[PDB]
Amino acid sequence: ATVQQLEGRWRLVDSKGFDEYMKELGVGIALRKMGAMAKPDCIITCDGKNLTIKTESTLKTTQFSCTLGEKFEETTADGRKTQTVCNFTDGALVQHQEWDGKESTITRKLKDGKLVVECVMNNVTCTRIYEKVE
Numbered sequence: 001a002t003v004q005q006l007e008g009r010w011r012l013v014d015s016k017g018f019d020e021y022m023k024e025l026g027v028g029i030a031l032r033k034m035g036a037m038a039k040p041d042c043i044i045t046c047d048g049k050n051l052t053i054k055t056e057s058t059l060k061t062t063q064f065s066c067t068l069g070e071k072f073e074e075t076t077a078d079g080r081k082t083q084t085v086c087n088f089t090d091g092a093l094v095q096h097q098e099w100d101g102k103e104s105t106i107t108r109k110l111k112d113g114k115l116v117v118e119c120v121m122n123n124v125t126c127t128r129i130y131e132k133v134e
């Protein structure tokens, strides 16, 4: 219901369709297997205006900060330069990515106290579940 319920550190506990989603993004099989094997924490921070999302695995960290509602450029882990906008809408944090006439949406919402992250591109959907650790 609020963005503050999404703030904190989350640990990945379940994943479904992530390989199909990365494949839809154009990610090579090597990066797909590395991404599938990773069990990253996700740290979400928000000061009212600025949203920061950090993804942390052993030896690998990526993080971006943006202003909610304002377009910005994202450098994704697979190496896309996207135009991205993050909004909080209808109880979910929605991250919309646009690049090369393509687009993808990552939605993060609270469900039964867990963080449910659904990544969509074209007609491929992936769902990843994290538990609160901090």
Ligand SMILES: O=C(O)[C@H]1[C@H](c2ccccc2)[C@H](C(=O)Oc2cccc3ccccc23)[C@H]1c1ccccc1
Residues within 6 Å of the ligand: 031, 034, 035, 038, 040, 055, 056, 057, 060, 061, 062, 076, 077, 078, 079
């Ligand atoms: O550029 C590289 O060599 C690597 C990229 C990268 C590593 C760390 C920070 C940002 C980007 C990809 C990669 O390792 O993604 C992840 C995989 C698994 C877990 C991750 C957790 C946090 C951040 C990134 C992760 C590597 C890569 C290889 C080839 C083409 C593009 C990217």
Ligand SMILES: CCCCCCCCCCCCCC(=O)O
Residues within 6 Å of the ligand: 022, 027, 031, 034, 035, 036, 038, 040, 042, 055, 076, 077, 078, 106, 117, 119, 128
């Ligand atoms: C860290 C996952 C592997 C990174 C390489 C593939 C790029 C996929 C980007 C989408 C990952 C974000 C979804 C999530 O928070 O679980």
